[PDB]
Amino acid sequence: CPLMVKVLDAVRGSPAINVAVHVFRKAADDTWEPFASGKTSESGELHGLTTEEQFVEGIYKVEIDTKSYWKALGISPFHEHAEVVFTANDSGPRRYTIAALLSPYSYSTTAVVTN
Amino acid sequence: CPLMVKVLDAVRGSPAINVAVHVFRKAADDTWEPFASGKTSESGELHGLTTEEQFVEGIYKVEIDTKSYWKALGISPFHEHAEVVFTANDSGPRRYTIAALLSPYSYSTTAVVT
Amino acid sequence: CPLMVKVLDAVRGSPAINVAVHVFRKAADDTWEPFASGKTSESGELHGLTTEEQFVEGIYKVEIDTKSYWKALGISPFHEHAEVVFTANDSGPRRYTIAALLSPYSYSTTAVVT
Amino acid sequence: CPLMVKVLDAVRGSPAINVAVHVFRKAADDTWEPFASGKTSESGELHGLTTEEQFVEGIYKVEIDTKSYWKALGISPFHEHAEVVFTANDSGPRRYTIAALLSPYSYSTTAVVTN
Numbered sequence: 467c468p469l470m471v472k473v474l475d476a477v478r479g480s481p482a483i484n485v486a487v488h489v490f491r492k493a494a495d496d497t498w499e500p501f502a503s504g505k506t507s508e509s510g511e512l513h514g515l516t517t518e519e520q521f522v523e524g525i526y527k528v529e530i531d532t533k534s535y536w537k538a539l540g541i542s543p544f545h546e547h548a549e550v551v552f553t554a555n556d557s558g559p560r561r562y563t564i565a566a567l568l569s570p571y572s573y574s575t576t577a578v579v580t581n
Numbered sequence: 582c583p584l585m586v587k588v589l590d591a592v593r594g595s596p597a598i599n600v601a602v603h604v605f606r607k608a609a610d611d612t613w614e615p616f617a618s619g620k621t622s623e624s625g626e627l628h629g630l631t632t633e634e635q636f637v638e639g640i641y642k643v644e645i646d647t648k649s650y651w652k653a654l655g656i657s658p659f660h661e662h663a664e665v666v667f668t669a670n671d672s673g674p675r676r677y678t679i680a681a682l683l684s685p686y687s688y689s690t691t692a693v694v695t
Numbered sequence: 696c697p698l699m700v701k702v703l704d705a706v707r708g709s710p711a712i713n714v715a716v717h718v719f720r721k722a723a724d725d726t727w728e729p730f731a732s733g734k735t736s737e738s739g740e741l742h743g744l745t746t747e748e749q750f751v752e753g754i755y756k757v758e759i760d761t762k763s764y765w766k767a768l769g770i771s772p773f774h775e776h777a778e779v780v781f782t783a784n785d786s787g788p789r790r791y792t793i794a795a796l797l798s799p800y801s802y803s804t805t806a807v808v809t
Numbered sequence: 810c811p812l813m814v815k816v817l818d819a820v821r822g823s824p825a826i827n828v829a830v831h832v833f834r835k836a837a838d839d840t841w842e843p844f845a846s847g848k849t850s851e852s853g854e855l856h857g858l859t860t861e862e863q864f865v866e867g868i869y870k871v872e873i874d875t876k877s878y879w880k881a882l883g884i885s886p887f888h889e890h891a892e893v894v895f896t897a898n899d900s901g902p903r904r905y906t907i908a909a910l911l912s913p914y915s916y917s918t919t920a921v922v923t924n
């Protein structure tokens with residue numbers, strides 16, 4: 467599991483469950499092509515997005531559908547979604563954990579990179 | 582204005598208005614003595630807490646009454662309040678801006694020293 | 696100033712100066728077309744990006760070139776840039792302030808709509 | 810494990826290791842009495858601070874010694890430490906995870922509460 471996503475809810479003090487996540491990889495023509503997708507579990511985590519063999523060097527975009535999350539809770543959020551863009555495995559295979567803390571008008575994202 | 586406080590509401594996307602703020606300075610006996618206090622304005626800011634002459638080197642604590650803020654909005658918050666403890670260096674001309682972003686179960690605080 | 700951008704540096708406790716910011720508006724064909732751009736001032740702010748007449752309802756993207764900022768400081772950052780995508784409602788008098796707090800491997804963004 | 814602490818480093822993109830944490834409980838005389846303490850592990854976590862039997866209702870303060878952490882890395886931080894104050898178990902036993910994201914001049918803390 468080289469890529470993991472963790473989403474938390476800052477308003478309810480709980481994991482953000484059933485949040486849709488789409489991952490894209492920048493193609494040779496500067497276009498974003500679908501790479502993987504899924505929904506966060508009851509623990510607010512999403513594992514098994516890819517494998518070490520498939521997760522090659524490149525620029526990846528992790529899109530978290532925050533809008534749908536807040537709408538489902540009856541809250542009108544500011545952002546359409548939260549995006550995290552980064553170059554991965556540029557100096558060898560690494561394990562990436564992308565974390566996001568969500569609020570209606572704000573969000574924070576941090577990355578923990580392991581070797 | 583050597584010391585300024587700015588509070589924002591992450592749930593409503595607006596300044597946090599009428600939030601009580603208490604500032605304390607560590608005394609010679611490791612005790613926290615009242616230094617200044619006030620409430621944030623409509624812009625979520627609090628200015629005029631002290632002057633350059635009074636704001637001497639020392640350890641200060643800025644306490645933001647976040648609990649009362651959320652209660653007034655009908656939200657049960659996690660924290661009793663938010664505290665920011667820092668040392669004023671006073672090594673050259675310096676203004677301190679303490680900013681806090683509030684959510685019911687989370688808050689972030691940052692300091693901008695210019 | 697219907698739209699304002701504020702960027703802070705969480706590592707140095709100062710405004711993030713000379714940070715490139717590009718704003719885009721979603722076109723009729725789901726494409727992002729250039730809308731406005733600039734660089735943050737010494738106060739870490741960027742004003743005068745647009746006017747009320749030009750800032751119509753739509754989906755906008757504010758892209759902050761964080762990578763170049765950290766590289767200039769000799770720090771290898773994680774993100775390529777920071778993006779803020781939002782819908783301008785235009786339901787009554789509204790000013791939008793997009794704030795970003797930057798760290799090498801993390802950033803927070805908040806919107807204050809008044 | 811009713812009380813857990815997780816600390817991350819926003820500058821290095823890694824867990825904050827060996828960070829001293831002190832927990833206090835408000836006594837009958839408005840005084841803070843020592844409750845438990847420890848240091849974060851290599852995963853930036855601190856478990857086994859207390860047990861369900863000992864963790865009774867009350868106001869607790871979790872103090873994270875952030876200053877020593879940054880000093881050890883050669884960075885002059887702004888805060889003396891990070892404090893998290895909250896009432897616990899007021900409506901029954903709960904599990905609390907206190908998370909902190911650290912930067913030299915900024916920190917964020919969030920709580921995840923489970924039943």
Ligand SMILES: O=C(O)c1cccc2c1Oc1c(C(=O)O)cccc1N2c1cccc(C(F)(F)F)c1
Nearest residue numbers: 472474563565566567578815817906908909910919
């Ligand atoms: O493990 C836990 O029990 C755990 C409990 C609560 C929260 C987190 C937890 O794990 C992690 C891990 C990890 O476990 O390897 C790695 C990165 C982020 C998080 N994570 C997280 C998510 C969003 C924001 C923040 C932060 F803002 F507080 F930093 C931290």
